[PDB]
Amino acid sequence: MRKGQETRERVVAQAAALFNVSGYAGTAISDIMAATGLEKGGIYRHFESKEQLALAAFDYAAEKVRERFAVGLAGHKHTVDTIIAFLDVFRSYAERPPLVGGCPILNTAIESDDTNPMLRERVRAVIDEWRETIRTLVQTGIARGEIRPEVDADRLALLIIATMEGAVMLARILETATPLEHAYTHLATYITQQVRLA
C-alpha cells in the first residue's frame, strides 16, 4: 500500500513537472512513462487515462502553489504586510517557480481557457482561493483601521493577480527577474500609498 501511494506520488509529481513545461496535449504519455520507469507498461495501474493523470497532476501543482502562499503569508501581523507578502510570493517565482516551468495556474489557464472545461474550473478555483484570501485580508484590515474603508477588495485582488501573473509571463520570456521586481515595487507602493490606513 505504501509502494502504491509513493509510486502514485512520483508519477503525479513527474507528470506535473512535464505538463508544466510542455502542456497537457504536448506532453506525450510516453515521456511521462519514460520519466517514471513505466516505458514497458503500467502507468494505467494508477490512472485510468492520461486525462485523469492530468487532473491529478494539476491538483498536485495547485497544492505546491498553496503551500508556497501558506508559508509566505505566515507570521505577519499587519494586514497590509500580509498582502505585500502575497506579492512577494509571486516575485520569488523569477528563479524559484512553484515547480519547474513556472506558475501552473498561469500555464494551465492559457491552455485550458479554450480547450478544457475541467481544467478551466480547477484553475478558476485556485484564482478564487486567492481572491478570497485578499478579500478576507482587506475586510479584517478595514475592521482594524489598517486599511482604508473605501477599498474595493475584489478589484484589488484582480489587479494583484493580473499584474503579478503577467510579470511571471514576462520574466520567463525575457529571462530576467526585472518585470517581477517592477510589478512588485509598483503594487507594494500603490498599496502602501492608496490602500493602507494606519
Separation CA 140–CA 37 (nearest Å)? 50
Residue 46 binding a second copy, by CB under 8 A? no
Among 172, 191, 195, 196, binds a second copy (CB under 8 A): 172
Environment class of 151 (CB within 10 Å of its CB; exposed 0-12, middle 13-18, buried 19+)? middle
Should residue 21 be labelled a site residue for a second copy when binding is judged by CB under 8 A? yes
Residue 56 binds what, of Mg ion, a second copy, none (CB under 5 to 8 Å, by partner type)?
Answer: none
Cβ burial of 90 (10 Å; 0-12, 13-18, 19+) is buried
Q: Which residues bind Mg ion (CB under 5 A)?
A: 110, 113-114
Instruction: Pick one of 70, 110, 118, 143: the residue that binds a second copy (CB under 8 A).
Output: 110
Separation CA 52–CA 130 (nearest Å): 25
Closer Cβ to a second copy, 169 or 197, answer by number: 169
Say how far residue 142 (Cα) sits from the centre of its chain: 27
Can residue 16 be called a binding residue for a second copy (CB under 8 A)? no
Determine which residue in the list 29, 158, 177, 188 makes contact with a second copy, applying CB under 8 A: 158
**What is the grid cell recorded at 77?**
501581523
Q: Segment near a second copy (CB under 8 A), from 20-28, 78-86, 133-141, 143-151?
A: 20-28
Sign for the CA dihedral angle at 137, 143, 148, 151 comes to positive
Residues 6 or more apart from 161 whose CB is under 8 A from it?
127, 130, 131
Do the annotations mark residue 113 as ligand-binding? Answer: yes
Instruction: Extract the annotated binding site for Mg(2+).
Output: 110, 113-114
- The residues of the shown chain that bind a second copy, judged by CB under 8 A, are 21-26, 100-102, 106-107, 109-115, 120, 123-124, 127, 155, 158-159, 161-167, 169-170, 172-174, 178-179, 182-183, 186, 190
